[PDB]
């Protein structure tokens, strides 16, 4: 989850001001403009920090789920678990931030594509990697990219 709420017994020492932003809980983007378009959408699964596609079908309104390729619709930068909603930057809007990478092969200057699971994989092109892939936990890799659209 974006914010796994767990109670602790001791405080964690947090004084260093460097290497403190590359974390799975840091939502949004590294650089943001007031004139960026943000859309809230119902979601299924957990598409946080991933490419999202709009799935259209008691009939219900279309939702968004992790995906990419020719069906890529946007990027999920924030999520609300209580309302089960996701904040999405459409593909027509450029974005800079840390997104989920498939593995550690991605390095700087690499052109990246959103796969069927919404993860960034090396090579239409969608993003340019700005840093190396960093393992947050287990198999979760976060890479800083500058999304510009589709080729």
């Amino acid at each position: 989850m974006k914010n796994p709420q767990h109670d602790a017994s001791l405080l964690s020492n947090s004084n260093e001001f460097r290497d403190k932003n590359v974390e799975f809980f840091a939502s949004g983007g590294t650089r943001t403009s007031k004139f960026d378009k943000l859309e809230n959408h119902p979601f299924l699964g957990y598409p946080y920090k991933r490419g999202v596609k709009r799935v259209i079908q008691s009939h219900y309104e279309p939702h968004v789920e992790a995906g990419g390729g020719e069906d890529l619709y946007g990027i999920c930068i924030d999520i609300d678990e209580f309302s089960k909603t996701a904040t999405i930057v459409p593909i027509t809007n450029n974005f800079e931030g840390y997104l989920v990478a498939k593995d550690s092969t991605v390095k700087v200057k690499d052109k990246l594509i959103f796969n069927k699971d919404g993860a960034l994989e090396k090579v239409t092109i969608n993003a340019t990697a700005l840093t190396d892939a960093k393992q947050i936990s287990n198999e979760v890799y976060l890479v800083k990219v500058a999304v510009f659209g589709n080729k």
Binding site: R31, S33, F35, D36, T92, N93, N94, V108, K109, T128, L130, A146, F148, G149, N150, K151
Partner: protein, 158 residues
């Protein structure tokens, strides 16, 4: 040429009596018709990408990324202004449409006419035609023997 403002000074005072054809100067930064809802970034400048297409250029890793004049399959945006003191370049992302005066390649500049499709070359200069949608809205205007500017409207990627 290599400066938005004329490097040399002047020995004359402007007349400021007419109002027609006074916007052809190279120092006319920004767009001709601009929206208040336009996303504007800034980047460190490598070279002089003023009034040219820009691409992302990286280094070894010791320093942050910068933008340099370029185009083709690496185009990132369009440079519309530069602060020389800070060496900063104002970039309009290719996802945000732009309309203004941009540098035109001095090769077939006479052939460029309103309605002609344009594209960015490897040096950030607009050339008569691929993957970017740019349309000329006027004819080439000569500022220097090698400097030509054209009013163009860029509206994304093909």
């Amino acid at each position: 040429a290599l400066m938005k403002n004329p490097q040399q000074d002047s020995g004359l005072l402007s007349n400021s009596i007419d109002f027609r054809d006074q916007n052809l100067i190279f120092s006319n930064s920004g767009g001709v018709c601009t929206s208040s809802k336009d996303k504007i970034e800034n980047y460190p400048a490598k070279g002089y990408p003023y009034k040219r297409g820009v691409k992302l250029s990286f280094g070894d890793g010791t320093t942050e990324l910068e933008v340099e004049a370029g185009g083709g399959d690496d185009l990132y945006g369009v440079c519309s202004d530069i602060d020389e003191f800070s060496g900063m370049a104002t970039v309009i992302p290719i996802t945000n449409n732009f309309t203004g005066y941009l540098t035109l390649k001095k090769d077939g500049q006479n052939g460029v006419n309103p309605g002609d499709k344009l594209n960015f070359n490897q040096h950030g200069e607009l050339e008569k035609v691929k993957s970017v949608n740019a349309i000329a809205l006027s004819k080439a205007h000569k500022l220097t023997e090698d400097l030509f500017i054209v009013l163009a409207s860029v509206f994304g990627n093909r």
